[PDB]
Design a protein around this ligand. Structure first.
Ligand SMILES: Cc1cn([C@H]2C[C@H](OP(=O)(O)O)[C@@H](COP(=O)(O)O)O2)c(=O)[nH]c1=O
Ligand SMILES: [Ca+2]
Length: 129
C-alpha cells in the first residue's frame, strides 16, 4: 500500500471525513472501524476525536487497500493518516471505535487494529468500560 496526499475539507463524524483528493471533494469512510453515531453513547466523543486529529494535522494522507476504493454510497474507502498517525487505529486504541466491516481484499491492517482493540478492551476504555 501507498500513501497519497489529500486536504481536509471538513470533519463529519467519528468514521467519516470530507477530503479534497486529486482535486475533487470526496467523503471518505474509514476502513475497518465503526464509531457510534453522534446520537449514541461515545458518538460525540468519537466525532470530537476524529475532528481534532484531522484539523490539527499538517499533512493528511489517504491510503487505499487492495480491494474496492468506493462504497455503494459513493464514499471513498481508505486508511486516513494525520501527520503519519493512522486515524482508524487511534480510534480503536482509544476505545472510540470497534473493529468492523472486515471484508477480504480490503483487510491489510486488520491484525494491527485488532491489537489496538485488545488493549482498549483490557484497559476497559470508553466503549469497553
Ligand atoms: C466500512 C465499510 C462500509 N461499507 C458499507 C456497509 C454498510 O452499508 P449497508 O448498511 O447499506 O450494508 C455501510 C455502513 O457504514 P456506516 O457505518 O457509515 O453506516 O457502509 C462498505 O461497503 N464497505 C466498507 O468497507
Ligand atoms: Ca458508524
Amino acid at each position: 500500500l501507498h500513501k497519497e496526499p489529500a486536504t481536509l475539507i471538513k470533519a463529519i463524524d467519528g468514521d467519516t471525513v470530507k477530503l479534497m483528493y486529486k482535486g475533487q471533494p470526496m467523503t471518505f469512510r474509514l476502513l475497518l472501524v465503526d464509531t457510534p453515531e453522534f446520537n449514541e453513547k461515545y458518538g460525540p466523543e468519537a466525532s470530537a476525536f476524529t475532528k481534532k486529529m484531522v484539523e490539527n494535522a499538517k499533512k493528511i494522507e489517504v491510503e487505499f487497500d487492495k480491494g474496492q476504493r468506493t462504497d455503494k454510497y459513493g464514499r471513498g474507502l481508505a486508511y486516513i493518516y494525520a501527520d503519519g498517525k493512522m486515524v482508524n487505529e487511534a480510534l480503536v486504541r482509544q476505545g472510540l471505535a470497534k473493529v468492523a466491516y472486515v471484508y477480504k481484499g480490503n483487510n491489510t491492517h486488520e491484525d494491527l487494529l485488532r491489537k489496538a482493540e485488545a488493549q482498549a478492551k483490557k484497559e476497559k476504555l470508553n466503549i469497553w468500560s
